[PDB]
Amino acid sequence: IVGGYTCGANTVPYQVSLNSGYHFCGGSLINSQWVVSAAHCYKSGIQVRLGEDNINVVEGNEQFISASKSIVHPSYNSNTLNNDIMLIKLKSAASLNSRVASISLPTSCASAGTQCLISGWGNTKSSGTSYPDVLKCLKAPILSDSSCKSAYPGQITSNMFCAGYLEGGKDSCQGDSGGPVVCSGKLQGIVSWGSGCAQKNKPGVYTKVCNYVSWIKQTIASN
Ligand SMILES: [Ca+2]
């Protein structure tokens, strides 16, 4: 996350780190057995780590649970990152408490200028490299479709939205594919892509999870 602040430990309860030896993607816990992340984050041998703040020290509220199954969306296109969403099932169920919790799916799509919360462990610099060990947050608005599609001519589909500032310097990207964008209580997105990090007129782009609730709920009940 470039240009945000330290969330505070265990303040984003539904936040997950996917670990293949090292932190490589974020995700959201949606019930005790399932995680949603981005498809461009598929890896074999995923361990899911819940209740993290500092992903490098065991501070006492973590649960570490192996993934049993990953399900990338049927129509994910890794060239355009259309349909960038993936379901990850836990080998044993999480135990839900104050610091590990689910986040609700959408009944409806968020609209533009709704304030959202975007979290992750992502790169914090726009030029160069610095990764933080603790959870980071940014508060930003869902930008209008126009101002989204204008920054990426011919790249934005119905299944993405943009959030952040047109002006540049607050953004994630790097700084955590796969992580949550939560608005008015409900998971409305997944960090997908974005040219550079926090350039002027290069907002972050996010999977529009509202379009996928029917599939998430069907898939998760059959597996
Ligand atoms: Ca930890």
From Swiss-Prot:
Residues 1-221 form the Peptidase S1 domain. One of its GO terms (molecular function) is serpin family protein binding. Subsequent cleavage after Lys-125 leads to alpha-trypsin. Further cleavage after Lys-170 yields pseudotrypsin. A cleavage may also occur after Arg-99. Not sulfated on tyrosine residue(s). It holds the Pfam family Trypsin. SMART domains: Tryp_SPc. PROSITE patterns: TRYPSIN_DOM (PS50240), TRYPSIN_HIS (PS00134), TRYPSIN_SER (PS00135). GO terms for cellular component: extracellular space; serine protease inhibitor complex. It is found in: Secreted, Extracellular space. The active site is at residues 40, 84, 177. Keywords: Calcium, Digestion, Disulfide bond, Hydrolase, Metal-binding, Protease, Secreted, Serine protease, Signal, Zymogen. One of its GO terms (biological process) is proteolysis. The keyword DNA-binding does not apply. It catalyses: Preferential cleavage: Arg-|-Xaa, Lys-|-Xaa. Its cofactor is Ca(2+). The keyword Calcium applies. Substrate binds at residues 171-172, 174-175, 177. Its EC number is 3.4.21.4. It is an enzyme of class 3 (hydrolase). Is inhibited by scorpion cyclotide trypsin inhibitor TopI1. Binds 1 Ca(2+) ion per subunit. Belongs to the peptidase S1 family. This is Serine protease 1. It comes from Bos taurus (Bovine).
